[PDB]
């Protein structure tokens, strides 16, 4: 399969997601936007061929409903209004994490047991977004007229006010940079001429006004003050029925981050304190620091006097946020013993891994900005010990703390024989955990008259890992659809009935093996999502 292993960036991942479960005609057009960047319809039809101009719009409305693209309108002084169309990178991640949301509703809503909406609440996620958008009038107007709909309608305000059901708007459907320009030009046209002093600061006068506007306008959909209708009759509280809403990835990805952190605890403590840590981890999940950092996405990240300000205030926000600094007193009532609440938390500060390490005395909270870099350094070194030799695990840590290691001190600091490390180091240049630094002791940088120095380079090592896993995801996805190509005449017969006795065998052996594909992918996708905390 050397054809596939060469020419494939993350475009081979992104093209095949709509090729997996959608019509075929949209896999062609989604590859065009990722390869070309941004383009409207008036130049789209020149790029593709085999799709009519309205058949583009017939195709474009399919991933429009599923929020898989994001548009932008810009008009010219001389020309008409031009609708530049971009790609949505998170709306297609919903198709990636599609099954995992169903296992998130159950493992986070544990107040109910043996309920008669277990089959139903697993279907609401299949109802809210497989249709695309969703409003309240869509499911009440189903085949069930009442069937105790008021119980079901009151069930979702329990399911919406916990999060990840934010009302959609233009903000969810427009990207992050094409909003910021005309609002910065709005603040810039708020400051006219007749202030000539410090004009370099007057250019930044709109920029200080843009920072407060950016946090304000991003909280407008997160503002829960208008997502509810206080009903004086036949109910007590209800969401507004005229709200079009889908899922939000933000609380899920923070919630998926929350499951990732406790797996370090089960390695770094036993079964008691990991159970103690699991409960208090849950309470801070609904209000947590943002994983994607929309401030740092695209903007003034090139200058360090601004690039420092993206974590100077963000540490002060995480430190001075009221909705996570627990008193370590309310933890005993949530566990199904305030001394043991303090004594089993004492091990969390004693370890050199900064979770529950720094705090004000009497109050306790878990830090975020200085914790997620330790988790990324921890798992990959274990992956080196997992898929290849543990001698590299010794060598990866030796070059880690010892900056600019030489070939003499590597046998002074680490203690192995000479022939084995050549059989271990040389695979790490190939996989880019170590790098080369050269000292020219002769003229014109002679290769033989030079000794070579090493480095960890904690950025390039993880970039190689990401595209190594993005390909391995789509490689297993490539082996999904090709198995459905053969033996298709009886899968068509397996979908026309809702019986040859020997033909049924060739449907189960192909079905048990694809069952292993989703399980290994779920094991694989958790290892990759550790490194989107950027």
């Amino acid at each position: 399969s050397l054809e596939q292993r060469t020419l494939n960036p993350d475009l081979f991942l992104y093209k095949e997601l709509v090729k997996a479960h959608l019509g075929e005609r949209a896999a062609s057009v989604i590859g065009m936007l990722v390869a070309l960047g941004r383009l409207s319809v008036r130049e789209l039809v020149e790029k593709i061929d085999g799709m009519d101009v309205d058949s583009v719009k017939t195709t474009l409305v399919s991933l429009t409903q599923l929020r898989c693209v994001k548009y932008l309108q810009e008009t010219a002084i001389s020309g008409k209004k031009t609708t530049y169309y971009y790609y949505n990178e998170e709306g297609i991640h919903i198709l990636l994490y599609s099954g995992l949301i169903i296992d998130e509703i159950i493992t986070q809503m544990r107040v109910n047991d043996e309920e008669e909406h277990k089959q139903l609440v697993a279907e609401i996620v299949q109802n809210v977004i497989s249709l695309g958008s969703l409003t309240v009038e869509d499911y009440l107007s189903s085949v069930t007229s009442d069937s105790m709909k008021y119980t079901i309608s009151s069930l979702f305000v329990q399911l919406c006010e916990m999060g990840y059901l934010i009302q959609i708007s233009k903000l969810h459907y427009t990207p992050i940079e094409d909003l910021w320009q005309f609002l910065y030009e709005k603040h810039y046209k708020n400051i006219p001429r007749n202030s000539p002093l410090s004009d370099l600061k007057k250019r930044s006068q709109a920029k200080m006004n843009a920072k407060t506007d950016f946090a304000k306008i991003i909280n407008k959909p997160n503002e829960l003050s208008q997502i509810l209708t206080v009903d004086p009759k036949t109910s007590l509280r209800i969401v507004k029925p005229t709200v079009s809403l889908t899922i939000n990835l933000d609380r899920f990805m923070k919630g998926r981050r929350s499951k990732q952190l406790i797996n370090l605890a089960k390695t770094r403590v036993g079964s008691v304190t990991a159970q103690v840590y699991k409960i208090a981890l849950r309470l801070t999940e609904q209000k947590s620091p943002k994983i994607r950092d929309p401030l740092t996405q695209t903007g003034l990240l090139q200058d360090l006097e601004e690039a420092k300000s993206f974590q100077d205030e963000a540490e002060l926000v995480e430190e001075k946020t009221p909705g996570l600094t627990f008193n370590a007193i309310d933890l005993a009532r949530h566990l199904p013993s305030a001394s043991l609440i303090n004594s089993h938390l004492k091990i969390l500060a004693s370890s050199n891994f900064p979770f529950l390490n720094e705090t004000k005395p009497g109050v306790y909270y878990v830090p975020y900005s200085k914790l997620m870099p330790v988790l990324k350094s921890s798992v990959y070194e274990y992956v080196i010990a997992s898929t290849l030799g543990p001698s590299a695990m010794r060598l990866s840590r030796c070059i880690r703390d010892n900056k600019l290691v030489s070939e003499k001190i590597i046998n002074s600091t680490a203690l192995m024989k000479e022939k084995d490390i050549r059989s271990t180091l040389a695979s790490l240049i190939r996989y880019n955990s170590v790098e080369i630094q050269e000292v020219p002791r002769t003229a014109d940088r002679s290769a033989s008259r030079a000794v070579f120095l090493f480095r960890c380079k904690e950025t390039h090592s993880y970039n190689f890992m990401r595209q190594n896993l993005e390909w391995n995801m789509a490689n297993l996805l490539f082996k999904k659809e090709k198995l459905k190509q053969e033996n298709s005449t009886l899968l068509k017969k397996a979908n026309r009935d809702d019986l040859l006795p020997s033909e049924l065998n060739q449907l189960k052996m192909v079905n048990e093996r694809e069952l292993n594909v989703f399980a290994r992918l779920s094991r694989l996708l958790s290892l990759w999502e550790v490194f989107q905390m950027a």
Partner: protein, 516 residues
């Protein structure tokens, strides 16, 4: 089967260029040349095991057989092989075209040194229908200067200086550009990183300023592997094509050309063949990449294997172009495609033709203008193909019985069912003369009235070539009339020229009415 076949003749609208991927190299190759030595010690006539002038790679002799397509020497059109490097090196031809595209990207996040709204302006000058190569390469000068006038990237803020050559054939990135602001985190870690090795062997203190980060082909390939497809159009590369990655612009794999391009010429100074320089440079390639592959696997010194891989870096940088030897020099691909009459002038623009003859020229008044007098001995050498019709049937039936011994006869024939030719001096002629299927072509000698052109070797202007009629004459020289010497500026002082004859019917007419 009972099955129809139909295909139109076609034309060429225009060639276009590309560099194919490293997955295309093995896609068109069929043999592999892992082993080194060309001639096995079996002492056979064609001892070639795997890694040599392989008989199903092609054929370089008349006594052998190409085992792939088929044939001895004419049926074989040659077949390609491939190599597999132990670790990739740069491309010597794209060495200029890989350092210009390195100055634009970041060195840490590997993103183009531009802002978002800035790069949206630049590609707008690409989308209009009026773009020439004059202004395509013109506006690409501006896109590189803006990245070179931009110190710190956008995704991680990493400072980037300049990258240029190290004058072997390797490049270095001068990453440090401070004016007076030494308070940078990278520089403070840099002196914090460097101080650990200063404790040991501190004689390298005079080498600290010259010390600098390098970019070998193994770092740069993964550097080129991270950069995305959406922004390729800003720096020369187009998307939507399979080989549209920049990863295929340095040598990772190398194809082996057929042996028709590198023929095993036998000089006949010995029973051994003088094997050309094309194979033995390729032989040192597969031998060097073998020991580097086995060297790191067994485990050898880094300082030992790095000069081997640098020797192999110079090795591929000579197989294509031997200008970079930096010293009887070896001939290369570039060293034969250009030059005075290497190619393109003595092989493409000016070729060598059949059906010609060069003797001296001689004056004669008695013959007319528009006609050259033809010596008879070359008249029974140079021929002309003549198709049979009912109009010329009686004449050609008389002509074929003359044979190649009297002048108005034939030398060869080609029947409509015959495939190659048939000789006339062997076999009976008159019994063969009686058949003469009308649908064929005969090969008669020259005669009076035919269309022959004539040239001067110093071609000053277009009237140095003129087409004439003929008349066969029993002497041994070229007789020409007195007037025509002026455009040929000839002098009959011992010089000589050749004459040419076309062998179609549309050129037999075209030469009279344009250069008569």
């Amino acid at each position: 089967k009972e099955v129809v076949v139909s295909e139109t003749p076609k034309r060429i609208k225009g060639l276009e260029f590309s560099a194919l991927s490293a997955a295309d190299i093995v896609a068109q190759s069929e043999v592999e040349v892992s082993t080194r030595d060309l001639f096995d010690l079996e002492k056979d006539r064609a001892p070639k095991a795997n890694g040599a002038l392989d008989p199903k790679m092609g054929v370089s002799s008349s006594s052998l057989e190409c085992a792939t397509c088929h044939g001895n020497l004419a049926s074989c059109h040659g077949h390609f092989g491939h190599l597999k490097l132990a670790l990739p090196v740069f491309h010597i031809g794209y060495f200029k075209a890989t350092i210009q595209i390195l100055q634009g990207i970041c060195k840490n996040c590997s993103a183009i040194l531009l802002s978002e709204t800035d790069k949206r302006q630049f590609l707008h000058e690409l989308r209009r229908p009026g773009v020439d190569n004059l202004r395509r390469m013109g506006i690409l000068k501006k896109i590189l200067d803006q990245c070179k006038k931009q110190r710190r990237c956008l995704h991680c803020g990493a400072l980037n200086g300049v990258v240029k050559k190290a004058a072997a054939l390797k490049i270095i990135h001068d990453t440090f550009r401070w004016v007076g602001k030494k308070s940078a985190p990278e520089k403070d870690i840099w002196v914090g990183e460097w101080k650990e090795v200063l404790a040991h062997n501190p004689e390298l203190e005079r080498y600290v300023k010259r010390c600098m980060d390098d970019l070998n082909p193994l770092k740069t390939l993964n550097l080129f592997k991270q950069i995305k497809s959406a922004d390729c159009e800003l720096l020369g590369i187009d998307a939507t094509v399979p080989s549209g990655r920049p990863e295929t612009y340095i040598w990772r794999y190398l194809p082996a050309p057929p042996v028709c391009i590198r023929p095993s010429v036998m000089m006949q100074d010995s029973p051994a063949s003088n094997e050309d320089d094309l194979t033995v440079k390729l032989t040192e390639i597969v031998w060097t990449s073998s020991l580097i592959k086995a060297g790191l696997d067994k485990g050898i010194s880094i300082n030992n294997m790095m000069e081997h891989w640098d020797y192999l870096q110079l090795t591929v940088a000579m197989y294509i172009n031997s200008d970079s030897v930096n010293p009887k020099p070896i001939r290369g691909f570039c060293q034969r495609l250009k030059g005075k009459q290497g190619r393109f002038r003595g092989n493409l623009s000016g070729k060598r033709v059949d059906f010609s003859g060069r003797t001296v020229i001689s004056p004669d008044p008695n013959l007319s203008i528009d006609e050259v007098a033809v010596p008879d001995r070359v008249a029974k050498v140079l021929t002309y193909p003549e198709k049979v019709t009912r109009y010329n049937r009686h004449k050609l039936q008389e002509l074929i019985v003359n044979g190649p011994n009297v002048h108005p006869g034939a030398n060869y024939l080609l029947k409509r069912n015959e495939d190659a030719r048939r000789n006339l001096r062997y076999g009976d002629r008159m019994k063969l003369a009686k058949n003469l299927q009308i649908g064929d072509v005969v090969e008669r000698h020259l005669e009076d009235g035919d269309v022959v052109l004539f040239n001067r070797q110093p071609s000053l202007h277009r009237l140095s070539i003129l087409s004439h009629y003929a008349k066969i004459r029993p002497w041994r020289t070229f007789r020409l009339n007195e007037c025509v010497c002026t455009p040929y500026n000839a002098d009959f002082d011992g010089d000589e020229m050749n004459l040419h004859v076309p062998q179609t019917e549309e050129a037999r007419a075209e030469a009279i009415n344009l250069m008569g």
